[PDB]
Design a protein around this ligand. Structure first.
Ligand SMILES: CCCCCCCC/C=C\CCCCCCCC(=O)OC[C@@H](O)COP(=O)(O)OCC[N+](C)(C)C
Lengths: 99, 266
């Protein structure tokens, strides 16, 4: 039984341009645990991204938090890109903010 | 629900062992060091340096035996590559459960491993392998019934400081991305709060707006929580709306934000 990941993107603090913040991508509810997750800035992969230790829920599905420190600008768009055996193509979820 | 548990994730290669106080990770096992990493000062609980040495050796031989144990018995039990084994065990009452390929497979009850009935004879034959040495099953029982209760008591004591802290939320408002035609999606973000229980509603004055859709509570790396609450409304009806947040850390003084300014706009 394969389970596709839920993908949620959020910032630690309100977006304020030129102010340091944290970008989060919480990926959950997936099986098997083999997964590839990237944080994207303007469609380009962000180099220094940390993640939590792999864990799983009561229903045995896995979950991970990916995050990175960042400073937003007016110009920049951020997203989370996920690939998993359940996905015929990498799934991309944008960070929605008001600009 | 006050509980401690250990989890094992093995993929066939990858072997991860970690300890948890509910959502909160407290321990990690490093195999090459063959040591138990304590993630917090108080992760050691009321257990002494020498007793932790004892636990490490048990964790030593048990993990490597089991990892390599699975690694060897695969063909017999019809385990096809790739496959994953997950187990979790701990106490609150105790428990120890094993999944294969993300499904309930076997569990440890009293003194032996029992197959989940819906898991077929494949599970039953795994139980025969797991129930070879009765003494080793007896060690497992004592780990769960004796050691784990003792441990969790000390851990909660030593961790009471960190565990019972109050961290105030911060909140903000934005436009949601997917409103239906003629409508807006108002979103109220709440972050930085601990502990977890929280209350958030869109309001018209003192009237709670029952259209308020609260998302999952999500983690942050600093150990605090995050939540978004959205409200869909007709665009000509978004005046005088506010988002109200209540939390134990605020002691009665709710955060209240108003849909206004450039949000409206004007
Ligand atoms: C290193 C991170 C964890 C540190 C924990 C320190 C505190 C210890 C506290 C309480 C005692 C442990 C309670 C749970 C133990 C359950 C019994 C038990 O054997 O649990 C062991 C597992 O959890 C860890 O790995 P495995 O031994 O590979 O999994 C089971 C092996 N198999 C053959 C059945 C598949």
């Amino acid at each position: 039984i394969q389970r596709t990941p839920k993908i949620q993107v959020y910032s630690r603090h309100p977006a304020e341009n030129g102010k340091s913040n944290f970008l989060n991508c919480y990926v959950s509810g997936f099986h098997p645990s083999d997964i590839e997750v990237d944080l994207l800035k303007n469609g380009e992969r962000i180099e220094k991204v940390e993640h939590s230790d792999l864990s799983f829920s009561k229903d045995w599905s896995f979950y991970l938090l990916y995050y990175t420190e960042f400073t937003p600008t007016e110009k920049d768009e951020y997203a989370c890109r996920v690939n998993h055996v359940t996905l015929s193509q990498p799934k991309i979820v944008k960070w929605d903010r008001d600009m | 629900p006050l509980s401690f548990h250990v989890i094992w994730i093995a993929s066939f290669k990858q072997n991860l062992v970690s300890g948890w106080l509910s959502d909160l990770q407290t321990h990690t096992w490093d195999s090459n060091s063959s040591t138990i990493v304590f993630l917090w000062p108080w992760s050691r609980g009321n257990f002494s340096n020498e007793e932790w040495k004892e636990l490490e050796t048990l964790f030593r031989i048990r993990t490597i035996r089991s990892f390599e144990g699975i690694r060897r018995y695969a063909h017999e039990l019809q385990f096809e590559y790739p496959f994953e084994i997950q187990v979790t065990g701990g106490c609150e009452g105790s428990f120890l459960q094993l999944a294969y390929q993300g499904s309930d497979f076997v569990s440890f009850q009293n003194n032996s491993w029992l197959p989940y009935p819906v898991a077929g004879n494949m599970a039953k034959h795994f139980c025969k392998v797991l129930n070879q040495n009765q003494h080793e099953n007896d060690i497992t029982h004592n780990l769960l019934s004796d050691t784990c209760p003792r441990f969790i008591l000390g851990l909660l004591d030593a961790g009471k400081a960190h565990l019972q802290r109050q961290v105030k939320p911060e909140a903000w408002l934005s436009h949601g991305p997917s409103p239906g035609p003629g409508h807006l999606q108002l979103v109220c973000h709440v972050s930085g709060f601990y502990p977890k229980p929280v209350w958030v509603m869109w309001m018209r004055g003192e009237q709670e707006q029952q259209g308020t859709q609260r998302g999952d509570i999500l983690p942050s790396a600093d150990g605090t929580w995050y939540l978004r609450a959205t409200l869909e409304v007709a665009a000509g009806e978004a005046a005088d709306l506010s988002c109200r947040v209540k939390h134990s850390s605020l002691e009665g003084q709710d955060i209240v934000l108003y849909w206004e300014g450039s949000l409206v706009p004007r």
